[PDB]
Amino acid sequence: SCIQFTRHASDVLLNLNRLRSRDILTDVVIVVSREQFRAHKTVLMACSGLFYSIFTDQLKCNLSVINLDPEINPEGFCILLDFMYTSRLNLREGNIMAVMATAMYLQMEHVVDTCRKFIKAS
Amino acid sequence: SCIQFTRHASDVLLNLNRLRSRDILTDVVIVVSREQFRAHKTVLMACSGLFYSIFTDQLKCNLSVINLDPEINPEGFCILLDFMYTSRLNLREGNIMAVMATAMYLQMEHVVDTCRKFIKAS
């Protein structure tokens, strides 16, 4: 018999993104080629099957630095990190291939699905 | 020119609640009278003006244990902690006064607003 506040989840995500932009309580650096991205482990786990597997591992859960596969494009990662914290995906003709490949690697099934749909249309 | 995934914020919050239920990456214990509640600092900050103030403080941001004011009722806190992680508020005749008082202390303005509306109706 609960009541529900419709905007609560969106407002929580917006505040988590504000913490990220101000580098507050970020507890991991994701290294993609030369590029470094600071984030919250919990948000990464909540969005990605790959980060979920990494941070539930008894040894890896304690690492402050995670290095991604050298094939991963920093721009593709950046677009996906922004999606994790906002629900908004900057999908463009020039980045769609790098975004799909990064989403497949990160195990973000809904992003993979929209990328496949957009590629099929063109 | 982004696209948006409608269910993303709700799905993120659902996964954060799954991490909480399994005690994964929880980094703080909130003590309310005898009762202890494990949580994620970032989620507490995203939902509460009080926890936002506490964990942005250069000294308090590093505490693993936070003790609330002895006037705070553990059940009222538990109902509010569940709301933070789910968007669902278990508001009942027998708990509404304790929920409103706890929400005022935690600075959760939307919960305070619905409590005042429900009290006014009765």
């Binding site: 609960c2 009541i3 529900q4 506040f5 419709t6 | 669902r88 508020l89 619905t114």
Partner: peptide
């Protein structure tokens, strides 16, 4: 607020 809604009835979920």
């Amino acid at each position: 607020w809604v009835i979920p």
